[PDB]
Amino acid sequence: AGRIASFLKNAWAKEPVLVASFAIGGLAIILPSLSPYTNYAIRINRATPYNYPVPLRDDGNMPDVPSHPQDPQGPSLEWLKNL
Amino acid sequence: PGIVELPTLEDLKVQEVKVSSSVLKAAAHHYGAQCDKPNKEFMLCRWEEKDPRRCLEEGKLVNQCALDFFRQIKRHCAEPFTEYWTCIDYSGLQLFRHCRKQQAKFDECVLDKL
Amino acid sequence: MNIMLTLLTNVTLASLLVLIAFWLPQLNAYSEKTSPYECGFDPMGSARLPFSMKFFLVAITFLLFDLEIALLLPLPWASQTNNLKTMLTMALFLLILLAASLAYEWTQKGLEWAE
Amino acid sequence: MPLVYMNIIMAFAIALAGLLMYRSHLMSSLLCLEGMMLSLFIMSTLIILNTHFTLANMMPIILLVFAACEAALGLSLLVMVSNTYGTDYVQNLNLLQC
Amino acid sequence: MTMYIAFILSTIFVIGFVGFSSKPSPIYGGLGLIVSGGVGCGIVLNFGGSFLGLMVFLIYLGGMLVVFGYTTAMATEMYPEVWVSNKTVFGAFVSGLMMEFCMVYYALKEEEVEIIFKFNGLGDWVIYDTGDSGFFSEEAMGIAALYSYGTWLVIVTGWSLLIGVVVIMEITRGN
Amino acid sequence: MNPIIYTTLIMTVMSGTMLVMISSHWLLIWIGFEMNLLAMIPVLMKNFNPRATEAATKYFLTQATASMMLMMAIIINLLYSGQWTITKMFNPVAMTMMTMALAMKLGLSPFHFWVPEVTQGISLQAGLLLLTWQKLAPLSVLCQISQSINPNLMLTMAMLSILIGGWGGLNQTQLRKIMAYSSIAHMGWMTAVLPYNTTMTILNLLIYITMTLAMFMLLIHSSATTTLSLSHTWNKMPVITSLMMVTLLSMGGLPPLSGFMPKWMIIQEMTKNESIIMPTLMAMTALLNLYFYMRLAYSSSLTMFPSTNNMKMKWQFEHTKQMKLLPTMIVLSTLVLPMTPALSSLN
Amino acid sequence: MFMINILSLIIPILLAVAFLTLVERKVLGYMQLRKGPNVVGPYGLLQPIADALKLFTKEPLRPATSSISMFIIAPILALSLALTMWVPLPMPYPLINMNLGVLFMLAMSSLAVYSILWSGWASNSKYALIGALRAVAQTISYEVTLAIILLSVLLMNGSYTLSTLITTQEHIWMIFTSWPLAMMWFISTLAETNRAPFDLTEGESELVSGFNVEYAAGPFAMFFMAEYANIIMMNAFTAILFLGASHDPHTPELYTINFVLKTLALTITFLWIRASYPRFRYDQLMHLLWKSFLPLTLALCMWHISLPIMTASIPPQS
Amino acid sequence: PFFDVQKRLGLDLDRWMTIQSAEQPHKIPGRCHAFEKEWIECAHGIGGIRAEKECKIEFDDFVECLLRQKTMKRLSAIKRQRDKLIKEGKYTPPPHHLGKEDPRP
Amino acid sequence: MWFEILPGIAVMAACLFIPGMATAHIHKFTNGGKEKRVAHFSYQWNLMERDRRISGVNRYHVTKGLENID
Numbered sequence A: 001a002g003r004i005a006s007f008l009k010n011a012w013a014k015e016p017v018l019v020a021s022f023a024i025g026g027l028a029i030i031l032p033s034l035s036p037y038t039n040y041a042i043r044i045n046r047a048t049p050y051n052y053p054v055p056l057r058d059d060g061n062m063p064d065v066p067s068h069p070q071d072p073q074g075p076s077l078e079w080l081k082n083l
Numbered sequence B: 001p002g003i004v005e006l007p008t009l010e011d012l013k014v015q016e017v018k019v020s021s022s023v024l025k026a027a028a029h030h031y032g033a034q035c036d037k038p039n040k041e042f043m044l045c046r047w048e049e050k051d052p053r054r055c056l057e058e059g060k061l062v063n064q065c066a067l068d069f070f071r072q073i074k075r076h077c078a079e080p081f082t083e084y085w086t087c088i089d090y091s092g093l094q095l096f097r098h099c100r101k102q103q104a105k106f107d108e109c110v111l112d113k114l
Numbered sequence C: 001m002n003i004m005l006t007l008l009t010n011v012t013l014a015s016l017l018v019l020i021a022f023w024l025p026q027l028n029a030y031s032e033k034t035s036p037y038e039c040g041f042d043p044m045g046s047a048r049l050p051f052s053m054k055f056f057l058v059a060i061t062f063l064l065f066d067l068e069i070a071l072l073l074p075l076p077w078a079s080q081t082n083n084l085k086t087m088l089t090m091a092l093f094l095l096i097l098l099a100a101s102l103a104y105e106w107t108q109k110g111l112e113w114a115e
Numbered sequence D: 001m002p003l004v005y006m007n008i009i010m011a012f013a014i015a016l017a018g019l020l021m022y023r024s025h026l027m028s029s030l031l032c033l034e035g036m037m038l039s040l041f042i043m044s045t046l047i048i049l050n051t052h053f054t055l056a057n058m059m060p061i062i063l064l065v066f067a068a069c070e071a072a073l074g075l076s077l078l079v080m081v082s083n084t085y086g087t088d089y090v091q092n093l094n095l096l097q098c
Numbered sequence E: 001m002t003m004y005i006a007f008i009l010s011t012i013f014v015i016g017f018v019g020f021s022s023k024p025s026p027i028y029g030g031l032g033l034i035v036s037g038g039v040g041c042g043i044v045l046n047f048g049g050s051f052l053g054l055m056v057f058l059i060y061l062g063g064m065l066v067v068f069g070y071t072t073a074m075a076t077e078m079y080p081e082v083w084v085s086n087k088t089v090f091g092a093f094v095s096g097l098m099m100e101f102c103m104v105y106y107a108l109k110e111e112e113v114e115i116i117f118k119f120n121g122l123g124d125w126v127i128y129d130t131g132d133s134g135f136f137s138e139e140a141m142g143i144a145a146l147y148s149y150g151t152w153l154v155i156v157t158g159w160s161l162l163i164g165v166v167v168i169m170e171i172t173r174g175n
Numbered sequence F: 001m002n003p004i005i006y007t008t009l010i011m012t013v014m015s016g017t018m019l020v021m022i023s024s025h026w027l028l029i030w031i032g033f034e035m036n037l038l039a040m041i042p043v044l045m046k047n048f049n050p051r052a053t054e055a056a057t058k059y060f061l062t063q064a065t066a067s068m069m070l071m072m073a074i075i076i077n078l079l080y081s082g083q084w085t086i087t088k089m090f091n092p093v094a095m096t097m098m099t100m101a102l103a104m105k106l107g108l109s110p111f112h113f114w115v116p117e118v119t120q121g122i123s124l125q126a127g128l129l130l131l132t133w134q135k136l137a138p139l140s141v142l143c144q145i146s147q148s149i150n151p152n153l154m155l156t157m158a159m160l161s162i163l164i165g166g167w168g169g170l171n172q173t174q175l176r177k178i179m180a181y182s183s184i185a186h187m188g189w190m191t192a193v194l195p196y197n198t199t200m201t202i203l204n205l206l207i208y209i210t211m212t213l214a215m216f217m218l219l220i221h222s223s224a225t226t227t228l229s230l231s232h233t234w235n236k237m238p239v240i241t242s243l244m245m246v247t248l249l250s251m252g253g254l255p256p257l258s259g260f261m262p263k264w265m266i267i268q269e270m271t272k273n274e275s276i277i278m279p280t281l282m283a284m285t286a287l288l289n290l291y292f293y294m295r296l297a298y299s300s301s302l303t304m305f306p307s308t309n310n311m312k313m314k315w316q317f318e319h320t321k322q323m324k325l326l327p328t329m330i331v332l333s334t335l336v337l338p339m340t341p342a343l344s345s346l347n
Numbered sequence G: 001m002f003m004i005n006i007l008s009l010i011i012p013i014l015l016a017v018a019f020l021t022l023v024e025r026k027v028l029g030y031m032q033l034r035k036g037p038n039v040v041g042p043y044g045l046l047q048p049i050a051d052a053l054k055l056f057t058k059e060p061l062r063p064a065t066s067s068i069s070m071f072i073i074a075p076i077l078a079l080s081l082a083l084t085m086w087v088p089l090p091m092p093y094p095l096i097n098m099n100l101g102v103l104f105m106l107a108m109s110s111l112a113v114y115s116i117l118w119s120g121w122a123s124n125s126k127y128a129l130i131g132a133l134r135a136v137a138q139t140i141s142y143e144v145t146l147a148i149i150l151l152s153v154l155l156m157n158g159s160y161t162l163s164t165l166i167t168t169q170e171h172i173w174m175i176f177t178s179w180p181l182a183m184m185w186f187i188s189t190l191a192e193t194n195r196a197p198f199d200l201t202e203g204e205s206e207l208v209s210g211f212n213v214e215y216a217a218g219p220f221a222m223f224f225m226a227e228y229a230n231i232i233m234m235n236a237f238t239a240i241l242f243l244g245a246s247h248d249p250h251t252p253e254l255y256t257i258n259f260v261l262k263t264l265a266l267t268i269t270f271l272w273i274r275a276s277y278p279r280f281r282y283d284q285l286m287h288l289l290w291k292s293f294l295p296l297t298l299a300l301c302m303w304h305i306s307l308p309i310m311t312a313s314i315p316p317q318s
Numbered sequence H: 001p002f003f004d005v006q007k008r009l010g011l012d013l014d015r016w017m018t019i020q021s022a023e024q025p026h027k028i029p030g031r032c033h034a035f036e037k038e039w040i041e042c043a044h045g046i047g048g049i050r051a052e053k054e055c056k057i058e059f060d061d062f063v064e065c066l067l068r069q070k071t072m073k074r075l076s077a078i079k080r081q082r083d084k085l086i087k088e089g090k091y092t093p094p095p096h097h098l099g100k101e102d103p104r105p
Numbered sequence I: 001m002w003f004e005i006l007p008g009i010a011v012m013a014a015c016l017f018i019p020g021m022a023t024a025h026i027h028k029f030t031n032g033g034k035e036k037r038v039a040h041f042s043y044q045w046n047l048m049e050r051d052r053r054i055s056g057v058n059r060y061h062v063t064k065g066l067e068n069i070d
């Protein structure tokens, strides 16, 4: 804890470029695991409709599937408009 | 290995929707809200049969629903829709973002009339 | 088609400039005028003799580091996948491996030119 | 097959033949090796594009990577041979017999 | 028969291959390989593969720059050879050109099995796709799938590149 | 070279071989071959000298050509059937090119010239690796596609390998070249029975690997690379020469030694088909390998050659490094014939 | 109609190059307490015309020892490539609209080095050869880091399309988000165009005329035009990439004016830098690009991959 | 030879890329998805020897989809006969094969 | 000065203005005056092809509105 501080000071005095590079790399490595918006990015990626949604045949036993796009059932994007 | 069955040219005729891409893009959201049922029926037929020759009547029904939708739009909101799709058409990417006043006026017109 | 026409036009313009440069002016060529330039004295050897490369090791490393560029270029599209945790782990794995290779060659004096 | 497939296969055969018959310079044979790699890249890319095999679009990149590794290996060996003899002639590699 | 653009590009590809396979000189061979890389980029572009064509062109440009430097350092002589400076190089070049022309005529006027299978021509437009869908490039999605599907490929490729750096350092050490 | 770097390179060689052996995709198999070659090239140049550099260059050129043909055969197979799985190889031209590429990698005759040269140009440890571990991947691939293989080409190359191995070995005084020609002949024996039964190929491969390891370890123990330098070993370590004599007898194929078992089983398997003439010629030809093994035994163990004065100083010192697996390798090379029915566990 | 567009692109670029020669001479003169061209034409406005007419009426020499085919091919390649590298630039609309414009510029620029390589080799003289190997070393120095910097910057664009850069920077310049990358990119473009302090290939004090020492007259002129067109093109690329002008779809002239002003400012900065500094040693350029720029570029590439994912700021158009 | 480590551990190191009908990104289909699917289903579990005979029809259809040899043969026959007919002047091709059609969306 | 450097800069600026303005005007002149369509993907190309077919004059730019559907 005392020799490494001196090593850090010497590196800052001799190779500032390497100090900055290593700090940036470590931050980029560890920050994404501690961020709450990573799952938000995943959800945004999952919400982009690249292909056509093929409808399902009504067997009369799917209350959770809407019968029209404007019905209350199905997923919602209201979380995205507040972002 | 057998002959391929094909519909006759008479079976393939239908009243055609002859509006350009910008008009369709301008009216697309309301068209998908209003004509949802025949379109979903046609798409289900198309993805279940895996053969375009078995879902021709559904395509004709889709065409008729689109024609009814556009006839209503003509009967009630001609000028606002014309302004909106001209705005949409000017853009090289046909962007919704650059014409919001025209879209708002068209939306008000259709909400009040229909 | 348009890009082919553009290439043809540019190459034609350059070729026409060369043609005009070589056919318009008066030419007076004789042996002294066309001899090789070495600051006024005749060269000792040939210019086709072997010319040593002091940075040969860095040149080979450039071949390997250039191919990791081809591996990293599709990254803008890879950011649109649903499993962002696997992709981000793999992008960092490739870049860490590329930094380790630079660190190895640096510490073994591979970046120093031969004397 | 179309004509383009035959042309690419002919290019591969020509590069292989080029590699098989050595003249004097080692570097020429290395160039023939790279030419075979390029021909294989082109052929595989055409086949994968024609059949719309989406996940196979990434194999030619891997091929290019290992082509680069092979070329680096060959160039290193050439450096060593030239340092030994002052020339990259294949005639000098005759110390070992059958 | 449509403008024969792909056939012409593939013929120029074969011609550049014959150019560097005759082995006139490393400087000339690299030029032929550069020409081949360019026409191959064009051939792949004409099939929808923009990214792959541009990538292979860039890679071979870098490789040929390194090869040019190495030729100047280790593969020179007083009189470098061109395709007309030597009977062996000229003979190989002419033989390659005549073989290519013979195969082209043979497969174009007849419908014959050269070695593997037969071919009548018609231009490579026939086998095309008439596929109508997408806000994305299918090739781009396939290549980008390397970071989600190709984890094993990424692992082996990165390991091989690191090992290649170590290997070249070991080989050129000398002693 | 750093020991850590050497260990990393050895593990990369083995990783390439294992990737070849466990993959289901042709691309992964090709990658395994590339990785194996890339890591193998520096191991051949570990002791740097012009002969080692020449051996490495020849090896690289041969194997790079072989891998190029391998990739072309894979691509042709993909073209005629959009399959990447390693299977019956739906195209015959692709199968022919694949067979030729794998034969080039193994060193089967006609493409056998590189093996004597690379073996003589490298050290005994590098030769041990090259002649034992480097046979596994091409043989495994050949085993996986044995059904689609054309017998006429494979059998022609196998018989040519046996003939050329015997004839070439007859002329050698260098021990590494003798080992290389022996390897060529044993590769021929391995590939002769491949279209009929891959279990026999595996059994022959294992027995050959054991005998080769024993021979190379005995040669490293007594630092001899020429016949005349091996003729001195009796005056320093007679036990080593006796064990080498018995192992050489085993390599020849004489019963009741373990070497006889693969040839016996391959002959039986080939006579279970019709195939009568080919085993007869193969045995008659293996008599040549027996001849030059016997000449080596005459020179090193059964007669005593003159020695030098300075051997007296060597008498006073012991071997520092000890190979822990050499006794087991010798015993497995010699006394394993009674356990022959245990080959059933190989399939 | 398309040929008219090609001509309307390529002729004004050549005129801009011709007058950039005069502008550089005058800027260097006034930074050196002198005037520069001011006699032939009001304020030296006719000096470029006189230079071009003198060069194209002067005898062209073919060296006795030189390879003639490559000797003639190299300047043609240089000028045609310099002209071609302009077609995908959106101003605000490009002449050729590509999905991957940036990769096209990368490939064409890496092809442009063979002009110097082949002219230097085909001259068959020693100074030309030294210039050519310096060109090899310079490309090896800058290429990898240039490509990685481009990738890192474009990770916020969402694609490789040059026109998307206009809408990406609709509200803020990209230089406020990646200014370290902007600095490294600027130095990389100085090195890529063989400009001071990285004008190693010509090497005037050290190598007389370097790679083009054998060249004279019209062929020599083509090399000069190609180099200055590359200067202007690279600065225009930098302006589009980092200082994004705002585009009104009903008034593209405003965008064109603003973009031209920005690229002119960057070109004047190039001339300023030339007037202000001494030259590198060409091993020092490689050490700078491989020991300082490369590690920082790798770290910033990691950072720019991570940042959009952490902040849920991923661009569109997969 | 082949050690099925993937099957033993259930890892899927490379099986994801072996066939064209296996889970492409964005559900983009191969050009011959149905033919390969039918050939695989038909030949599954019966072994290689039996499959080469009893699934020859599906494999022939799949190869026809892959390379399209019979299709170009038929098209070239049709075009040759049409050219022969027009040369002697006995066809009079229809107006919609000469560019004077009435296009539909 | 220094303001005598300005005429050359003005000439260069006028020269560099020409490509962008010329491209914009030529795009407008050959596309009905409405900003030539961009087709980076096959869907946009299909839209353009459909527009060309229904125009009746074989040009994608001519647009048929509500008056073409009776």
Ligand SMILES: CCCCCCCCCCCCCCCCC[C@@H](O)O[C@H](CO[C@H](O)CCCCCCCCCCCCCCC)COP(=O)(O)OCC[N+](C)(C)C
Binding pocket: C013, C016, C017, C019, C020, C023, C024, C025, C026, C027
């Ligand atoms: C910017 C790019 C685009 C610009 C567009 C214009 C491009 C112009 C084309 C490029 C060439 C420009 C050079 C102009 C000078 C003329 C050069 C040459 O063509 O003239 C003579 C060509 O003449 C030949 O020597 C022989 C005479 C004609 C040959 C007969 C061929 C059969 C033609 C039939 C003629 C009958 C009447 C023609 C009218 C129908 C060559 O003489 P030569 O001394 O060596 O070369 C040096 C020229 N000097 C004297 C000016 C220094």
Ligand SMILES: CCCCCCCCCCCCCCCCC[C@@H](O)O[C@H](CO[C@H](O)CCCCCCCCCCCCCCC)COP(=O)(O)OCC[N+](C)(C)C
Binding pocket: C083, C085, C086, C089, C093, C097, E148, E149, E151, E152, E155, E158, E159, H023
């Ligand atoms: C028994 C001895 C163990 C030690 C020796 C190991 C030797 C091999 C080296 C690494 C082991 C390989 C196992 C990993 C195989 C990758 C595939 C698996 O892990 O799943 C992936 C999970 O990925 C995870 O991130 C694990 C990979 C993490 C890799 C860390 C680096 C380890 C490499 C170090 C050794 C390699 C050589 C040295 C270079 C540093 C994908 O999961 P997912 O995306 O959900 O589903 C994909 C299917 N989709 C597309 C339909 C959605």
Ligand SMILES: CCCCCCCC/C=C\CCCCCCCC(=O)O[C@H](COC(=O)CCCCCCC/C=C/CCCCCCCC)COP(=O)(O)OCCN
Binding pocket: A008, A011, A014, A015, A018, A019, A021, A022, A023, A024, A025, A026, A029, C096, C099, C100, C102, C103, C106, C107, G291, G295, G296, G298, G299
């Ligand atoms: C943790 C994540 C890692 C990934 C991110 C990094 C991305 C890429 C960065 C690494 C690239 C390669 C590293 C290069 C290693 C250089 C080795 C070396 O030899 O160093 C010496 C210099 O000596 C040094 O080693 C410099 C000091 C030690 C290394 C630099 C700092 C190491 C880490 C320090 C900071 C750690 C994190 C920051 C915390 C900040 C504290 C608040 C080089 O100088 P020469 O060229 O030999 O000079 C010759 C002329 N006389």
Ligand SMILES: CCCCCCCC/C=C\CCCCCCCC(=O)O[C@H](COC(=O)CCCCCCC/C=C/CCCCCCCC)COP(=O)(O)OCCN
Binding pocket: A014, A015, A017, A020, A024, G180, G182, G183, G184, G186, G187, G197, G238, G242, G273, G277, G288, G292, G296, G303
């Ligand atoms: C909160 C998360 C954020 C993450 C971190 C972000 C902040 C990071 C801060 C650091 C960024 C610094 C970037 C600088 C990159 C280079 C720095 C450097 O060290 O380079 C110099 C070299 O750089 C130069 O000197 C440049 C040489 C060429 C000079 C040419 C003229 C100068 C340019 C004039 C102004 C340029 C303006 C650039 C931008 C223009 C607009 C695009 C090293 O050389 P040496 O001093 O010799 O030491 C190395 C060995 N010890």
